Each structure stands twice: as structure tokens, then as C-alpha cells.
Design an enzyme around this catalytic site. Structure first.
Site, PDB file in Angstrom:
ATOM      1  N   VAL A 120      26.851 -30.417   6.849  1.00  0.00           N
ATOM      2  CA  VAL A 120      26.040 -30.215   8.080  1.00  0.00           C
ATOM      3  C   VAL A 120      25.553 -28.781   8.190  1.00  0.00           C
ATOM      4  O   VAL A 120      26.316 -27.868   7.879  1.00  0.00           O
ATOM      5  CB  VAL A 120      26.888 -30.549   9.317  1.00  0.00           C
TER       6      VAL A 120
ATOM      7  N   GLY B 201      29.627 -26.652   8.163  1.00  0.00           N
ATOM      8  CA  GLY B 201      30.629 -26.966   7.135  1.00  0.00           C
ATOM      9  C   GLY B 201      30.373 -28.291   6.476  1.00  0.00           C
ATOM     10  O   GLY B 201      29.392 -28.963   6.821  1.00  0.00           O
ATOM     11  N   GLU B 202      31.246 -28.657   5.555  1.00  0.00           N
ATOM     12  CA  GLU B 202      31.100 -29.942   4.838  1.00  0.00           C
ATOM     13  C   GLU B 202      31.653 -31.060   5.716  1.00  0.00           C
ATOM     14  O   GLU B 202      32.226 -30.738   6.765  1.00  0.00           O
ATOM     15  CB  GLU B 202      31.868 -29.898   3.523  1.00  0.00           C
ATOM     16  N   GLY B 203      31.479 -32.323   5.307  1.00  0.00           N
ATOM     17  CA  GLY B 203      31.938 -33.498   6.086  1.00  0.00           C
ATOM     18  C   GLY B 203      32.549 -34.554   5.173  1.00  0.00           C
ATOM     19  O   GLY B 203      32.549 -34.324   3.946  1.00  0.00           O
TER      20      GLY B 203
ATOM     21  N   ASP C 221      34.454 -48.024  14.249  1.00  0.00           N
ATOM     22  CA  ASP C 221      35.592 -47.081  14.215  1.00  0.00           C
ATOM     23  C   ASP C 221      35.597 -45.956  15.232  1.00  0.00           C
ATOM     24  O   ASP C 221      35.544 -44.797  14.829  1.00  0.00           O
ATOM     25  CB  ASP C 221      35.801 -46.561  12.804  1.00  0.00           C
TER      26      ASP C 221
ATOM     27  N   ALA D 278      29.385 -36.095   3.835  1.00  0.00           N
ATOM     28  CA  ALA D 278      28.137 -35.393   4.222  1.00  0.00           C
ATOM     29  C   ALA D 278      28.349 -33.878   4.353  1.00  0.00           C
ATOM     30  O   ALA D 278      29.481 -33.423   4.171  1.00  0.00           O
ATOM     31  CB  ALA D 278      27.625 -35.984   5.511  1.00  0.00           C
TER      32      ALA D 278
END
Lengths: 97, 57, 287, 122, 100, 117, 299
Positions: free
Chosen positions: G14, G7-9, G125, G12
Site C-alpha cells: 500500500v 507498508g506491505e500487506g 471474513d 498486497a
């Protein structure tokens, strides 16, 4: 709230179509036609359920008034039970002592 | 009046089984109204690679 | 760098570098001849030493450009950029990528990695170029930024010889009282460090040892020697052996510094005209 | 309003595209995918129009749509629950009315003068 | 189903009761269990280097000097980052290497 | 903490509000010598939900053994190695809202013979 | 050879598969950015940091940029595929929640944190997620986009960058400088969640999150690290009587009680250190950390 759902639906549709167009040359073309019509069924279902939503958008304000009515009558029922409750708390707690 | 008007007369114009429920559809894309999808990327323009991918037979 | 990473990218000795530069020059020459744009060994092809001289003069100009940046710049960012530029031409040739594009790009990528969070107006304001021409260069900058990392093997961290200097001076304020208030030592050491940076020292020697040698040269120039400090480092493993290696490295560093000189502008302009004509020659890539 | 007709034309174009790509086609059937992308662009324009429209809808509409009924059934059920609560509340108030009447009847039987003065004062 | 399914075969025999009537029907007792797996990877020493060495706390002349380019400052000290963190980073980095 | 067998702990409020469901809670009131914070019923209350989690996370699980509706409510302390594996540690019995620890058939007899002789 | 589309990020996309080379399973990243400007800033800062930091940080509890290429505009980063993530695992309705296993997860996370602190590069983070569990179950840390070096030279230290729920109390104030404190308090909130099973302090937006942290640990004492209001932006928070750690997570073994009290300590100076925490006797105790062979796996 329907504007956010409309935007998110359009975004997910365009992104899934982008993934489909990316795998379109990759997939075997004969079965890729089947995958295309499956994706077209997905988009048609998304859009028809959005069509049901924008149909009900005329009937939204009446349901808002119905929620107002229901809240008001629930409040008056709580008033009745609170009166009976405070009379019981008079009759069994304060007068016994 | 009868209120069992089908999900047709309601959604009547669209072709296909509009009345069919989401469980029967078994589509990952359909599961979207219940939980909103994230706008990871903005809508992009059509490209030649897409047309080359399709073009039927 | 006990942090590894640069452990792989620490070329060990002068000859290997010479050989690598020479080989990339040959590589470009050959690809072009094979493509067959030209008959072999025409006038246009350059020579590696000439390419290196042009690179050094243009890099001194790039250092002046880093210094005149309108926002204040940490010495770390300037250094990172120079190192990145030297390491880039150890894999390719001057002609394949014009030095001006490479310099500007090394600078922007460097700023992004080092967290200087540069403002976009500040960067455009510093360049003395027409906005349209600066935007044309910026379009190339984008593609050449990705190209840089590809040929940089994605090894981005660069060790900057500063941090060690501050550290050795604190050790100075504490372990040895023989020398005192070593700040004259501080400025002279800075002078030696810029001259050290222009050389292939970054590539060969260890940066901490580079800082220690700058301190030692400053001390010898002014009247102090650190045998005793060298003696506290002798209070360590290798017993006697550590000192001979330290002395040999110091001597080689002094020799390169004394031999290194800025290339003459008269020679450099001849070279510039030749290279300009060279990129104006037909390359053209692929369809 | 206009978002309905726009998305309806988009859905009909999607159906015609599924029909055409279902069939082997000599003609450039990439026009179907281009019309789908243009429908997505017009849906982005309709999303600007939905920022203009600002509709707020409860979730049980989405869930009854998932069941595939009319949302008109949800309107009837909200109306029916409104009348159910109104019936119950009017009935409780009516029993209180009958009880007050019975109480004043019986107290007027047992205490004449006091309930006489009460009916005077009201 | 009389054969493949139980079809009340388990209904025929119930052995009185061993849960409500009395919990003393256990009789046949057993145990002998072992695992031998405890206190694993407590050790925290993964220290690596190709350099000379320096201690984490200073409490030395360097701490007494307490002087950097700007020394230390009070308001930001809430920020933490006591110069201590400061000289440690500085020295460690400088010492890193020295011998390829 | 000197002798757990020789301690009794109680609380009047919880006494009228006592039922088969609340016996574990009464043992759990805290500040009760017999029960401990280490027990997992505590880690469950801290976290959320009490279901088949005692069979999932296996360990110190105080569980009701036998119950008479008015007063008698016996509790057992188990130490589980795995699901379907139970090891009984001790038994604490509550009579009339008064918690005692069940005496060993032998510690009781030893003390008894000692006093008589 | 792209074989899957996980899927998308956030910045980004993947895909999971085997590369042009060996058949081994790996996760492949494709660069994502808004390139519309004719004056794009080239690659993003988060990407630049993440790639080099992951490449440098090589540890059994840290993921690493292995292969990396970029012939097209595309930049490809190679990271090993992992099983899932602790966050969804404990998020799901109790399938098999277990502390001897929670303690093992905490040990892997702490070893990873010790290595990152030693390498002299803060993990800006850690969030509940952004932590990944592999098939063996060794958990190695992953998202490295927001990290930065922390050193002696004074430089614009980024601020309010961390997510509100996992923001450090000093960061919540508005502090211009920082130290291992952010990462320590955040592991602390992740442990909190494993024990409590739901997130510890809920903040809709900055001020509400600061108020809830204060409510959970009480008003910080004047003795704590006075200047707590002398940092640049402070607002006296409610004068809570205060609740013991015993109050918020009702119970567990007191050694765990102590690690918690310690990561929490308010003075950034006293927030416990990584080596210090491993050295805590809680890790060397009768309860044994799971080897990971028996580590719980859902679907």
C-alpha cells in the site's frame, strides 16, 4: 528460536532494501546518498546484534543448566514452606476441633 | 575476571558504534528482535532499476 | 439489476452498439495508418460486419469448448464468460487481440471470479493442444487477463439469465393454477435462452425480462398464454402502461431470434484466412 | 558457526558499501548494492543453515543486547543467581542441622532414657 | 523565579479547608447543562430497487411446495441455509430489473 | 424494591475482611438492593483495570466519600456529564457492616411528624 | 504520485498519496502475488472478489473501489484513506474507553452489515481488524477478500476459510453449507471484545477454539437445533454446567445483555438478523449513540 528470528530479520532487511531501491530513482540523488548510508547503518546494526546472538550461541547450554538449577532450588524452597504450612494447618485447625 | 568486557572484544570487528543502544539508534528497522516482523514477501533478485537509482554521481 | 453497477453498463439501443463497434474499427485503422506502417486503406484492413461474423462463429466454437470442459461447469460460469467476451470487443478490434487468446482468457478469468475453484490439471487436460504450445498460450493468457479488466472498466459482475428463470417458475407453481406442471415449458424455454444468448440481447434487454419472454414464447409455442400472469404483474404500478412496454420488448426479441442465423463455415474460413494474414502483418508496439 | 562468519563478511561489505556510497565514485558503485543483494542471498543460504542449526535463545539476551552490553554479562548473572539460590538453600539446611543438634542435646538433658534409646535406634 | 514561578505564593492563602475539614464549602453551585442529542439513526429502511417486490418470510404456496432442483435436505440443514434462504435469493434476483 | 430507604443488606464473610480498599467491593457484592448492575464500576470489573477510567468514561460511579477505619464507610452515587463535572445522586452509609440509605432531611421529618400526630 | 509507503500487506502493498489527477488524499494498492511459476494463475481469487464486490457495494458504511487502472503488470486499486482501526484503538491501554461510543461503533457496524446482507453477498471474513475508522469516524467495513455470494443453486461452499477465533460454531463443526450466520456470530465476538476489552474466546487451533466457545456458552441443549452433532463432523464437547452471559462479561445495561444473548443463540436459524438487531429497542434508548463528532481519537 534464533532460526525464526534470523529468517524474519533477513526478510525485513530485504523488504526495506526493496522499498529503498524503489524510492532510489525517485528520491533526490544527493540526499538519497544520505538516506542510503542511513539504511546502511540500519542494516549494520541489525547484523551486529545478530552477530552478538551467534556469539552467545556457544554460551546457551550453560544458561540452560543454570535455569535447571534455579528451578530445582526454588522447588526445594517451596517444599520447606509447604512443610511449615501443613504443620500450622495441623496445629491451628484440626487439633482445636 | 572483569565481565564489563565492552560490547567490543564482543562485536569488535564491525565498524560504526556497535555499543550504542537501540534507543540512541532511533531506527525503526532495529526494532525487530523484540517483536518478529512478518515474512510478507520472499527475497527478490537485484534489478537494473536499482542500479539506475544509485550509480553514485 | 437494482444492485446498480450494470446500470452504467446497460447500453440502451441497437444503434449505439453499432456505432461503437464501428468506431473501434476506425480507431485501430487510424492508429496503424498514423504510425505509418502502411499507406491508408490497404487490402488488409477488415470491415466491422465481417469482424462480427467471424467473432460469432468463433464464439459458438468457444461455447462448445466450455461444454466439453472435463470438470462439470455451472451454466452461470459459461454465461459469464460469453458476456465478458462480447463486452471486450465493444471497446477494441479483432486484430488488436486475436480472438483465440481472448476466448481462452475470458474463460480462465471467469472461472476465477465465479468461485469454481478450477484444478490446474483439469484446465490443461481439457485443451486439445501440445503442453509446450498450451504453456506459450498461458504466458499470453497472463498479460491479456490484466488487459481484459483494464478495458472491462473493472466492472466484473455479470447478471446471468438463469436465477430469474428458477424464480419465475416458483412463482408459477404458486400464484397461477391456470397453467400446470410447466416443465415442457422449462425445456423449450432453455432452447429459447441459448438462441437468446447468441444475440445482443444480453447487452440490450433486462435479463429478468429476457427470462419472462423465454417463458412466454415457450407458452405460445405449446398452447398457453400468460395474460393472467401478465395480469398479476398489472396488479402493480403504471396501471395499464406496463403491458405495452412488455409486449413491444417481446416482439423485438422474437424478431432478432428469427433473423439471427449461424454464419456459414465457407464464408467463415475465407474470413479466417484474411484475419490470420492480418495478425501475421507487422504491428510491433514500442521500445 | 558458519553463519557468524557469513554475516560478518556481510556486515563488512555493508560498511565498505556505506563508505563508498558516502564518497563520490567514478567506478560503478552499483557493485556495492549487488554485493549487498548477494549477501542477502547468502544470508538466505545461512537461514537454511540456521534451519540446520536450530538455536533457541531467551529474550533477555535480546534485551541486554538492546542495552548494548555483553550477553556474557547475562551469563555471569545467571551463574550468580544459581549460586545465590544454592547459598540460600544450603544455609536453610544448615540451620535445620544446628537446630536438630540443639534439640537432641536439650531433650537428652531432660529425657535421658528416651534419647538414649533414640540414639541407639537412630 | 519569585515572580514568574509561584514560589509559594499559593502557600500564603489556603482558605482554611474545603475537602477534608468539611465538604460544605461548595456554596456557589451551578448547572444549567443541555445537549439534546438522542435516538439518532434508529430507522433501518434504506431499501432501494428498480424492480417489482417480494416478502422475506414465505409461509405461502412456495414454502408449502418446498421444492427446488434437489428440494431441501436434512443432514446439511444443520448447515442452515434452509431452502427458505434459497427461494428468497432466487426470486429476488430474478425480479431485479424487468424495466431498465 | 418497594422502598430503598427501608432496606438493609449484609454479609458476614466480607465483615472481618473489610478495609478502605474493599468498601466498594462490599457494595459491589451483587444481590445488594442499594447498588445496581447498570453502575459503571460493574462495567469496569467486567472489562479490565480501575484507574482514571471513571474520569474518562463518565457516568454512574459509586465512590467512597468519607471513611472511618473500623466501621464507618460512606459511599456516594454520582452521575458525571463530563470530566470535572459531578452531580450527586444519593448517599449510602455503612455502619458496622450494615448498609443503609441516608434519609432525606425532609422525608424522615414527614414520617416522624405523621407517627407522632 | 506516490507520496507515502505505509507498508506491505498479506497479498498486497500500500502507498498513501495523491494520484496522477486531483490533490485529494487516497490510499493506493499495488497487486502482490507469487508469479514465479511460468504457469501463473494470473490474478488471485481474493483480489478478483475484493475488487468487484467493493465496486458493487456502495454504502455510507462500506468502502468502495473508486478509480482502478493497470497499464503495467501492476494493477492499481483506489480506496479512500481512513484514520486507523477499532481494533488497535481498543487494544491500547485504556486512553478513553467509553460505552456510549462503543454503542455508536456497534450501530455503524450493524448498518454496514445490513446493507451487505441486503445486497445478497456474505462478508466472509469480518475479523477484529479488517474494520477501519476514518477521520470523521464513520466506520466502514473493508477487507473483502474472502467474501462470496450465497444463493439457491447448490455449489462447493468454501469451508474452514474464516479465522479460528471468529469461526462460526456451525463452521467449527465442519458444515458444508452456511448462511448469514457466520457474519452475525462474528459481529457478536467483536462486541464481546469491546465490552470485555480483551478477546472473548481464545483458540490456539481449531479444536481448542471450539472447546472454548462451548465453555463460554455451555454445552448446547439437545432442544437447541438437534443435528448439532448430526452435521458432518462433531465431537461431544465437555458437558459444561454452563455460565450465564452475566458470567463472562460481568455487567452493563441489560439491553446490551439482550443483544448479546440474541446474536449468540445457537440454532443458526435463530441467530438474530441484521434488520432484526437494528429493530432491537437497545439502539432506540435513553443512552444516545455518538454522532461521531465527539467520537474518541487516540494519538
Amino acid at each position: 528460536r534464533l532460526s525464526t528470528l534470523i529468517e524474519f530479520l533477513l526478510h525485513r532487511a530485504y523488504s526495506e532494501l526493496m522499498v529503498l531501491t524503489d524510492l532510489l530513482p525517485r528520491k533526490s540523488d544527493v540526499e538519497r546518498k544520505i538516506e542510503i548510508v542511513q539504511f546502511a547503518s540500519r542494516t549494520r546494526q541489525l547484523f551486529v546484534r545478530l552477530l552478538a546472538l551467534v556469539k552467545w550461541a556457544n554460551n546457551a547450554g550453560k544458561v540452560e543448566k543454570c535455569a535447571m538449577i534455579s528451578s530445582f532450588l526454588d522447588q526445594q524452597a517451596i517444599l520447606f514452606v509447604d512443610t511449615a504450612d501443613r504443620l500450622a494447618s495441623l496445629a491451628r485447625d484440626a487439633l482445636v476441633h | 575476571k572483569k565481565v564489563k568486557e565492552k560490547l567490543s572484544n564482543f562485536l569488535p570487528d564491525l565498524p560504526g558504534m556497535i555499543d550504542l543502544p537501540g534507543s540512541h539508534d532511533n531506527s525503526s528497522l532495529r526494532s525487530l528482535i523484540e517483536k518478529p516482523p512478518i515474512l510478507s514477501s520472499s527475497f527478490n533478485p537485484i534489478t537494473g532499476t536499482m542500479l539506475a537509482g544509485f550509480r553514485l554521481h | 439489476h437494482n444492485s446498480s453497477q450494470k446500470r452504467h453498463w446497460t447500453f440502451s439501443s441497437e444503434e449505439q452498439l453499432a456505432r461503437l463497434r464501428a468506431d473501434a474499427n476506425r480507431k485501430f485503422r487510424c492508429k496503424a495508418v498514423a504510425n505509418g506502417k502502411v499507406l491508408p486503406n490497404d487490402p488488409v484492413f477488415l470491415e466491422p460486419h465481417e469482424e462480427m461474423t467471424l467473432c460469432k462463429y468463433y464464439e459458438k466454437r468457444l461455447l462448445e469448448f466450455c461444454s466439453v470442459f472435463k470438470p462439470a461447469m455451472p451454466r452461470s460460469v459459461v454465461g459469464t464468460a460469453c458476456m465478458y467476451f462480447k463486452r471486450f470487443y465493444l471497446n477494441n478490434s479483432v486484430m488488436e487481440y486475436h480472438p483465440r487468446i481472448i476466448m481462452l482468457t475470458c474463460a480462465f478469468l471467469a472461472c476465477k471470479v465465479d468461485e469454481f475453484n478450477v484444478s490446474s490439471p483439469q484446465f490443461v487436460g481439457n485443451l486439445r493442444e501440445s503442453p509446450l504450445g498450451q504453456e506459450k498460450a498461458l504466458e499470453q493468457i497472463l498479460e491479456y487477463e490484466l488487459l481484459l479488466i483494464q478495458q472491462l472498466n473493472f466492472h466484473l459482475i455479470v447478471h446471468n439469465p438463469y436465477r430469474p428463470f428458477e424464480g419465475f417458475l416458483i412463482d408459477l407453481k404458486t400464484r397461477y393454477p391456470i397453467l400446470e406442471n410447466p416443465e415442457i415449458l422449462r425445456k423449450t424455454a432453455d432452447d429459447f435462452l441459448n438462441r437468446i444468448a447468441l444475440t445482443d440481447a444480453y447487452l440490450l434487454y433486462t435479463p429478468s425480462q429476457i427470462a419472462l419472454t423465454a417463458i412466454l414464447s415457450s407458452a405460445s409455442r405449446a398452447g398457453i398464454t400468460m395474460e393472467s400472469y401478465l395480469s398479476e404483474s398489472l396488479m402493480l404500478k403504471e396501471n395499464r402502461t406496463c403491458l405495452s412496454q412488455l409486449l413491444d420488448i417481446m416482439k423485438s426479441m422474437r424478431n432478432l431470434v428469427k433473423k439471427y442465423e449461424p454464419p456459414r463455415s465457407e464464408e467463415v474460413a475465407v474470413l479466417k484466412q484474411k484475419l490470420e494474414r492480418c495478425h501475421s502483418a507487422e504491428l510491433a508496439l514500442n521500445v | 558457526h558458519l553463519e557468524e562468519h557469513l554475516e560478518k563478511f556481510v556486515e563488512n561489505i555493508r560498511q565498505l558499501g556505506i563508505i563508498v556510497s558516502d564518497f563520490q565514485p567514478s567506478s560503478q558503485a552499483g557493485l556495492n548494492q549487488k554485493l549487498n543483494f548477494i549477501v542477502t542471498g547468502l544470508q538466505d543460504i545461512d537461514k537454511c543453515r540456521q534451519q540446520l542449526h536450530d538455536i533457541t535463545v531467551p529474550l533477555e539476551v535480546f534485551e541486554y543486547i538492546d542495552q548494548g552490553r555483553n550477553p556474557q554479562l547475562y551469563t555471569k548473572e545467571c551463574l550468580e543467581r544459581a549460586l545465590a539460590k544454592n547459598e540460600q538453600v544450603k544455609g536453610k539446611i544448615d540451620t535445620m542441622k544446628k537446630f536438630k543438634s540443639l534439640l537432641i542435646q536439650e531433650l537428652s538433658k531432660v529425657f535421658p532414657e528416651d534419647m538414649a534409646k533414640y540414639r541407639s535406634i537412630r | 523565579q519569585l515572580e514568574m514561578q509561584l514560589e509559594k505564593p499559593k502557600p500564603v492563602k489556603p482558605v482554611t479547608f474545603s475537602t477534608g475539614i468539611k465538604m460544605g464549602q461548595h456554596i456557589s453551585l451551578a448547572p444549567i447543562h443541555k445537549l439534546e442529542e438522542a435516538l439518532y439513526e434508529y430507522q433501518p429502511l434504506q431499501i432501494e430497487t428498480y424492480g417489482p417486490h417480494v416478502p422475506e418470510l414465505e409461509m405461502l404456496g412456495r414454502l408449502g411446495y418446498l421444492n427446488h432442483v434437489r428440494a431441501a435436505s436434512p443432514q446439511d440443514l444443520a448447515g442452515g441455509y434452509t431452502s427458505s434462504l434459497a427461494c428468497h435469493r432466487a426470486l429476488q434476483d430474478a425480479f431485479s430489473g424487468l424495466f431498465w | 424494591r418497594d422502598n430503598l430507604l427501608g432496606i438493609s443488606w449484609v454479609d458476614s464473610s466480607w465483615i472481618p475482611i473489610l478495609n478502605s480498599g474493599s468498601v466498594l467491593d462490599y457494595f459491589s457484592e451483587r444481590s445488594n438492593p442499594f447498588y445496581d448492575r447498570t453502575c459503571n464500576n460493574e462495567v469496569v470489573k467486567m472489562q479490565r483495570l480501575t484507574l482514571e477510567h471513571l474520569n474518562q468514561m463518565v457516568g454512574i460511579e459509586y465512590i467512597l466519600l468519607h471513611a472511618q477505619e473500623p466501621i464507618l464507610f460512606i459511599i456516594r452515587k454520582q452521575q458525571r456529564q463530563s470530566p470535572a463535572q459531578v452531580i450527586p445522586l444519593a448517599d449510602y452509609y455503612i455502619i458496622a457492616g450494615v448498609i443503609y440509605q441516608a434519609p432525606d432531611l425532609g422525608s424522615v421529618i414527614n414520617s416522624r411528624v405523621l407517627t407522632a400526630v | 504520485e506516490k507520496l507515502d509507503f505505509l507498508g506491505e500487506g498479506q497479498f498486497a502493498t500500500v502507498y498513501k498519496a495523491r494520484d496522477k489527477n486531483t490533490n485529494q488524499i487516497v490510499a493506493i494498492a499495488k497487486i502482490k502475488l507469487g508469479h514465479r511459476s511460468e504457469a501463473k494463475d494470473g490474478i488471485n481469487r481474493t483480489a478478483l472478489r475484493e475488487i468487484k464486490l467493493l465496486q458493487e457495494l456502495s454504502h455510507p458504511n462500506i468502502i468502495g473501489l473508486l478509480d482502478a487502472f493497470g497499464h503495467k503488470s501492476n494493477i492499481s486499486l483506489v480506496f479512500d484513506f481512513m484514520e486507523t482501526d477499532l481494533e488497535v484503538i481498543i487494544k491500547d491501554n485504556s486512553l478513553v474507553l467509553t460505552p456510549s461510543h462503543i454503542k455508536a461503533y456497534m450501530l455503524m457496524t450493524l448498518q454496514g452489515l445490513e446493507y451487505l446482507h441486503q445486497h445478497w453477498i456474505l462478508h466472509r471474513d469480518l475479523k477484529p481488524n479488517n474494520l477501519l475508522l476514518d477521520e470523521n469516524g464513520v466506520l466502514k467495513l473493508a477487507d473483502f477478500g474472502l467474501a462470496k455470494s450465497f444463493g439457491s443453486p447448490n455449489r462447493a461452499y468454501t469451508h474452514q476459510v474464516v479465522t479460528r477465533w471468529y469461526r462460526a460454531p456451525e463452521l467449527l463443526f465442519g458444515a458444508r453449507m452456511y448462511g448469514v450466520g457466520v457474519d452475525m456470530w462474528a459481529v457478536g465476538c467483536i462486541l464481546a471484545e469491546l465490552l470485555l476489552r480483551v478477546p472473548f474466546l481464545p483458540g490456539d487451533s481449531d479444536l481448542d477454539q471450539l472447546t472454548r466457545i462451548f465453555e463460554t456458552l455451555g454445552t448446547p441443549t439437545e432442544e437447541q437445533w438437534p443435528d448439532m452433532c448430526s452435521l458432518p463432523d462433531y465431537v461431544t464437547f465437555k458437558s459444561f454446567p454452563g455460565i450465564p452471559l452475566h458470567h463472562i462479561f460481568s455487567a452493563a445495561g441489560d439491553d446490551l445483555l439482550d443483544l448479546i444473548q440474541g446474536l449468540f443463540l445457537f440454532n443458526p436459524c435463530a441467530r438474530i438478523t441484521a434488520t432484526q438487531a437494528l429493530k432491537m429497542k437497545y439502539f432506540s434508548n435513553r443512552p444516545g449513540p455518538t454522532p461521531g463528532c465527539q467520537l474518541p481519537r487516540p494519538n
